[PDB]
Amino acid sequence: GANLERTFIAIKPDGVQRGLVGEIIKRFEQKGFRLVAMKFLRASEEHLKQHYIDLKDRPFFPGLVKYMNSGPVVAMVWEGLNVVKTGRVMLGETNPADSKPGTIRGDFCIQVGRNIIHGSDSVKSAEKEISLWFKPEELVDYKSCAHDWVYE
Amino acid sequence: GANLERTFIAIKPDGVQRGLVGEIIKRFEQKGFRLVAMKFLRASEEHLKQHYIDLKDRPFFPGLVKYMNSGPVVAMVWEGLNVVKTGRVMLGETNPADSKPGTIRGDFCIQVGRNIIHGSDSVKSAEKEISLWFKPEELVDYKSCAHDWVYE
Amino acid sequence: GANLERTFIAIKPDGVQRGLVGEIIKRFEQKGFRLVAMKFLRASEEHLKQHYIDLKDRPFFPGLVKYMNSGPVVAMVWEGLNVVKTGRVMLGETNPADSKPGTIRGDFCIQVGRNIIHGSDSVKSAEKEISLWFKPEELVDYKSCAHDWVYE
Amino acid sequence: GANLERTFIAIKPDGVQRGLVGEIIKRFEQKGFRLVAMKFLRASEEHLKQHYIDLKDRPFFPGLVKYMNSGPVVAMVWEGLNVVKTGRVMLGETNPADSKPGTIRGDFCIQVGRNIIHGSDSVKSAEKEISLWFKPEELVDYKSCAHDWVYE
Amino acid sequence: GANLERTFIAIKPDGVQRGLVGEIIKRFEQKGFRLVAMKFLRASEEHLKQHYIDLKDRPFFPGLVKYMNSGPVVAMVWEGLNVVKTGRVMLGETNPADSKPGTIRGDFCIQVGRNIIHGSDSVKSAEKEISLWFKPEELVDYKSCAHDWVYE
Amino acid sequence: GANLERTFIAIKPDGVQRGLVGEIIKRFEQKGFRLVAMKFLRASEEHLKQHYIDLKDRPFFPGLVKYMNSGPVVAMVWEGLNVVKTGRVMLGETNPADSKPGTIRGDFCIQVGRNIIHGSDSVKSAEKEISLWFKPEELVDYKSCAHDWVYE
Numbered sequence: 072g073a074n075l076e077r078t079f080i081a082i083k084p085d086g087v088q089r090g091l092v093g094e095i096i097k098r099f100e101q102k103g104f105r106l107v108a109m110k111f112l113r114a115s116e117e118h119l120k121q122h123y124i125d126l127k128d129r130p131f132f133p134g135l136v137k138y139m140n141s142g143p144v145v146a147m148v149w150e151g152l153n154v155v156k157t158g159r160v161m162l163g164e165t166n167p168a169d170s171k172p173g174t175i176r177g178d179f180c181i182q183v184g185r186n187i188i189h190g191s192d193s194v195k196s197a198e199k200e201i202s203l204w205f206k207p208e209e210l211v212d213y214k215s216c217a218h219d220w221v222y223e
Numbered sequence: 224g225a226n227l228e229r230t231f232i233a234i235k236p237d238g239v240q241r242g243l244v245g246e247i248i249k250r251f252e253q254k255g256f257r258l259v260a261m262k263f264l265r266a267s268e269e270h271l272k273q274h275y276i277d278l279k280d281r282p283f284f285p286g287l288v289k290y291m292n293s294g295p296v297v298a299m300v301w302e303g304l305n306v307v308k309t310g311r312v313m314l315g316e317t318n319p320a321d322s323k324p325g326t327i328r329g330d331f332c333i334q335v336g337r338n339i340i341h342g343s344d345s346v347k348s349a350e351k352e353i354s355l356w357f358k359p360e361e362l363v364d365y366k367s368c369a370h371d372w373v374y375e
Numbered sequence: 376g377a378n379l380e381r382t383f384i385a386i387k388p389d390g391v392q393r394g395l396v397g398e399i400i401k402r403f404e405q406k407g408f409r410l411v412a413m414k415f416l417r418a419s420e421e422h423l424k425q426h427y428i429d430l431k432d433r434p435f436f437p438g439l440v441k442y443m444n445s446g447p448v449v450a451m452v453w454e455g456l457n458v459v460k461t462g463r464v465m466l467g468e469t470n471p472a473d474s475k476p477g478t479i480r481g482d483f484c485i486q487v488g489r490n491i492i493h494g495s496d497s498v499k500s501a502e503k504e505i506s507l508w509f510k511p512e513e514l515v516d517y518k519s520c521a522h523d524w525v526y527e
Numbered sequence: 528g529a530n531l532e533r534t535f536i537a538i539k540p541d542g543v544q545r546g547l548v549g550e551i552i553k554r555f556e557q558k559g560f561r562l563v564a565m566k567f568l569r570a571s572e573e574h575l576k577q578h579y580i581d582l583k584d585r586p587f588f589p590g591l592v593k594y595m596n597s598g599p600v601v602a603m604v605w606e607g608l609n610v611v612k613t614g615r616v617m618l619g620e621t622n623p624a625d626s627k628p629g630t631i632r633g634d635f636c637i638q639v640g641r642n643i644i645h646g647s648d649s650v651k652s653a654e655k656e657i658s659l660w661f662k663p664e665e666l667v668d669y670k671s672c673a674h675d676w677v678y679e
Numbered sequence: 680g681a682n683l684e685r686t687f688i689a690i691k692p693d694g695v696q697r698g699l700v701g702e703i704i705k706r707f708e709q710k711g712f713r714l715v716a717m718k719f720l721r722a723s724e725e726h727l728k729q730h731y732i733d734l735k736d737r738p739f740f741p742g743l744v745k746y747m748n749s750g751p752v753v754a755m756v757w758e759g760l761n762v763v764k765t766g767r768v769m770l771g772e773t774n775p776a777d778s779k780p781g782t783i784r785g786d787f788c789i790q791v792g793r794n795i796i797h798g799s800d801s802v803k804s805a806e807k808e809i810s811l812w813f814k815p816e817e818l819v820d821y822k823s824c825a826h827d828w829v830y831e
Numbered sequence: 832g833a834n835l836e837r838t839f840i841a842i843k844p845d846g847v848q849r850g851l852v853g854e855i856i857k858r859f860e861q862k863g864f865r866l867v868a869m870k871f872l873r874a875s876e877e878h879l880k881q882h883y884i885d886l887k888d889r890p891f892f893p894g895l896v897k898y899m900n901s902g903p904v905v906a907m908v909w910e911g912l913n914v915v916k917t918g919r920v921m922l923g924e925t926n927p928a929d930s931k932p933g934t935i936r937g938d939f940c941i942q943v944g945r946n947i948i949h950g951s952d953s954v955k956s957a958e959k960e961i962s963l964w965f966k967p968e969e970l971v972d973y974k975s976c977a978h979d980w981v982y983e
């Protein structure tokens with residue numbers, strides 16, 4: 072059903088370096104979304120080139136890959152109603168210049184090349200990103216104790 | 224005066240159950256509004272039918288009444304300049320899908336049937352709600368120590 | 376059972392005036408205690424004299440009663456295992472000079488005659504205080520959604 | 528270049544009196560802006576009349592000057608990419624009625640004559656305000672340890 | 680040398696269920712410890728029996744294993760000077776009855792069988808726990824941008 | 832009188848670099864202390880050698896002076912009953928290893944040579960430090976709006 076939608080959220084190396092992991096996770100927990108999966112890694116160049124395969128011809132691509140490999144990331148899957156679209160609202164606009172106060176990027180960063188976090192742009196993108204970053208058995212099935220107070 | 228306006232705010236059963244009472248009251252205190260009245264109760268079905276009398280023919284009404292009776296609520300009166308309209312802004316849109324990050328519903332909930340909080344929609348509705356939920360003697364008259372730093 | 380113990384907590388007029396209501400309630404919610412009752416009132420002199428009957432001959436008593444009547448208080452009942460003794464630890468020592476950082480008094484106040492909050496000193500005192508400050512029907516029976524995650 | 532832009536931010540006497548200094552500074556730190564200068568003073572009437580010279584014929588001006596002299600302010604300079612315009616977004620609208628939740632004014636104040644904070648409206652105004660409020664040697668040159676994680 | 684010490688911290692199923700993951704991580708980040716490894720899983724009964732092999736004859740053991748399997752945990756490795764001993768101080772006493780306000784257990788839980796978090800008790804135990812819970816390649820080597828401001 | 836006591840608090844260059852200025856100031860404001868003076872500067876080597884004159888023969892002294900000059904500090908004066916001794920409690924032990932959770936050093940740092948903050952050790956030392964670091968005219972006389980709710 073619609074309440075079982077999932078999105079991929081990654082905290083980028085700048086978000087880890089600037090000590091924002093706990094703050095970001097809290098935002099998702101407090102909203103009522105369910106954490107499905109989480110790991111911490113330095114993504115290989117090859118892995119990142121696959122993640123960003125659509126951008127391989129963009130002028131910023133070599134620098135993007137180097138930056139995304141320049142420290143570890145936190146990779147996550149979150150579940151809930153409209154979590155892809157709502158996750159993007161919670162992150163704010165991709166360019167922090169346009170991100171509103173109250174959003175993750177609006178509160179915590181400045182420049183588009185150092186924009187702390189990624190969220191899937193669509194359900195189709197989410198499922199592709201989840202398959203790339205996680206093994207199926209890393210996605211945990213459990214029920215939140217407050218589920219019936221979050222959902223009708 | 225305009226600064227003597229009051230609104231009725233109720234934290235719904237899901238807000239209590241999910242441990243948001245303190246967080247919500249803090250939002251109103253830190254803004255500069257004055258807490259006038261507060262009580263904690265399980266509202267009866269008869270009481271809720273009166274509260275929601277305008278909705279009695281809406282298809283969601285029986286379920287709404289049952290949910291609103293399914294645990295305790297925190298009922299409050301807050302005072303301040305434009306507190307009705309500003310209170311509604313602070314809560315966010317009634318549908319959490321449309322509530323912006325930074326608002327109570329935007330930060331803390333997902334689905335319209337579990338939308339954690341109520342605020343009066345108008346001054347007229349506020350006075351009706353205050354009369355329904357509170358005895359006149361339960362509204363306390365005192366002056367905030369910071370009043371002259373909040374108002375010219 | 377031991378998990379059904381209750382205590383009386385009151386936020387004193389200075390706690391209300393200094394905008395600490397939300398912060399204090401959040402401390403109790405986040406610990407895993409269940410809010411049973413809550414109301415907001417200006418306690419009469421006669422009421423306060425009964426609450427402080429043991430102190431009626433102490434030199435500070437007239438001033439104590441006047442201060443406790445000088446604005447509204449938030450009166451509450453909280454439930455949980457050892458909530459009386461643990462509640463006192465959470466508040467800190469009655470004299471804020473001796474209250475450790477991390478406690479309510481340690482974090483938020485300075486002087487013993489303006490010590491923001493009261494908690495029952497014993498189960499026997501709690502049951503007396505609960506009877507004095509609340510009508511039986513103001514104590515709400517409900518079960519926390521996270522109860523099985525707070526208690527074995 | 529663009530990352531070296533500076534703005535003038537002043538916490539007004541109401542923001543000091545209401546205990547918001549730390550909360551406001553934290554908002555600027557967490558965003559990634561660099562604190563360049565800071566001091567705490569009661570601004571003289573003459574000083575304030577110069578700061579507000581463009582408003583000298585507005586009907587609210589005498590009251591504005593009196594209020595701005597009625598307690599100390601925190602005067603600050605912050606540096607970063609688009610810090611003038613982004614600083615203004617973070618503050619919210621000058622009139623708190625229109626300031627969104629998540630912004631400093633939206634979260635913490637109510638009325639235009641008690642609007643807790645000032646930010647420069649333009650780079651040209653910022654440089655004028657910085658010269659008026661600060662001696663050149665009070666602007667400290669240092670590099671943030673996280674600079675390369677905030678800026679590409 | 681001493682600054683390279685590591686500990687194993689696990690957020691127990693109750694900590695996940697009660698929405699404390701972000702809050703706990705933030706405590707470690709803000710202190711200056713470096714996150715080395717993190718994953719999210721439901722630990723098997725066999726895995727838990729190995730982790731708790733020293734407790735296998737304690738009367739609470741069967742229930743402990745069931746509870747530790749009853750939802751996912753967040754498993755982490757953290758690095759820094761005296762992180763084992765300091766980590767334990769930050770968590771508080773293993774029995775929440777004795778955990779002081781300001782500690783993780785003191786702030787957020789009540790009963791020993793639902794005590795939200797684990798930390799290694801010694802360096803020897805930490806290295807054993809890290810080997811049990813993590814593959815060597817899951818421990819990420821990077822340098823914190825603030826390392827020279829945390830350590831001389 | 833006793834409520835007019837003052838102490839000197841400095842946030843050291845590590846506390847500024849790690850983004851803790853807001854957090855530290857908030858701890859003092861929320862306690863009920865009055866901010867008297869504040870400025871931001873890079874203290875000269877000569878100034879620091881005077882501040883630390885008692886330590887001039889200790890083996891760590893050259894490094895201490897270089898670190899304390901290696902970025903800006905926030906220097907402050909705070910007023911209130913027992914503010915020197917209570918300030919020290921709020922900071923925690925000078926050695927962060929021994930600082931309890933809930934204190935500034937306990938929550939936010941690790942090693943003695945990077946211990947984020949200084950507070951005067953005695954009233955005599957406070958008055959000496961205030962004279963060294965501030966001009967008399969930088970200490971602002973104003974009355975907190977909540978004074979009568981903090982003090983009897």
Ligand SMILES: C[C@@]1(F)[C@H](O)[C@@H](CO[P@](=O)(S)OP(=O)(O)O)O[C@H]1n1cnc2c(=O)[nH]c(N)nc21
Nearest residue numbers: 126131134135165166183184185186189192679
């Ligand atoms: C920030 C990004 F990682 C985006 O996520 C992703 C695709 O952006 P797009 O397809 S335009 O839209 P989204 O759905 O992800 O917003 O490329 C990055 N990116 C975009 N523009 C720039 C730029 O000028 N400089 C640098 N350094 N990185 C940029």
Ligand SMILES: C[C@@]1(F)[C@H](O)[C@@H](CO[P@](=O)(S)OP(=O)(O)O)O[C@H]1n1cnc2c(=O)[nH]c(N)nc21
Nearest residue numbers: 223278283286287317318335336337338341344
């Ligand atoms: C959440 C509510 F309590 C509203 O606040 C209130 C008035 O709704 P409306 O007539 S749109 O007026 P405003 O609240 O915008 O002033 O009825 C509830 N409500 C509205 N739509 C729905 C729905 O689809 N399902 C369920 N379960 N409850 C709903």
Ligand SMILES: C[C@@]1(F)[C@H](O)[C@@H](CO[P@](=O)(S)OP(=O)(O)O)O[C@H]1n1cnc2c(=O)[nH]c(N)nc21
Nearest residue numbers: 430435438439468469470487488489490496983
């Ligand atoms: C603050 C208090 F309300 C205490 O909670 C309560 C019970 O006294 P006691 O049995 S010593 O306290 P606990 O061990 O239960 O905390 O009396 C008040 N109190 C105590 N000493 C003083 C004082 O010098 N001046 C003023 N103004 N109030 C005082």
Ligand SMILES: C[C@@]1(F)[C@H](O)[C@@H](CO[P@](=O)(S)OP(=O)(O)O)O[C@H]1n1cnc2c(=O)[nH]c(N)nc21
Nearest residue numbers: 375582587588590591621622639640641642648
């Ligand atoms: C709050 C302010 F300090 C404004 O920032 C500044 C410039 O006003 P404006 O020309 S509308 O420009 P922006 O702030 O949009 O740049 O005057 C103050 N101000 C504006 N309207 C009022 C008022 O009715 N009463 C009082 N007491 N102060 C007012």
Ligand SMILES: C[C@@]1(F)[C@H](O)[C@@H](CO[P@](=O)(S)OP(=O)(O)O)O[C@H]1n1cnc2c(=O)[nH]c(N)nc21
Nearest residue numbers: 527734739740742743773774791792793794800
């Ligand atoms: C909470 C624990 F996980 C301890 O960490 C661990 C080792 O306990 P111990 O030998 S006292 O060692 P430390 O905690 O001092 O390291 O056993 C658990 N535990 C202890 N007592 C009890 C109990 O009565 N019921 C339940 N359910 N779990 C208990």
Ligand SMILES: C[C@@]1(F)[C@H](O)[C@@H](CO[P@](=O)(S)OP(=O)(O)O)O[C@H]1n1cnc2c(=O)[nH]c(N)nc21
Nearest residue numbers: 831886891894895924925926943944945946952
């Ligand atoms: C951290 C300090 F600035 C102390 O505040 C101050 C006064 O020392 P003491 O008189 S023993 O402490 P308090 O009176 O302030 O409690 O010397 C510094 N200090 C002490 N031990 C060490 C050390 O091993 N390495 C380095 N790098 N700095 C140290």
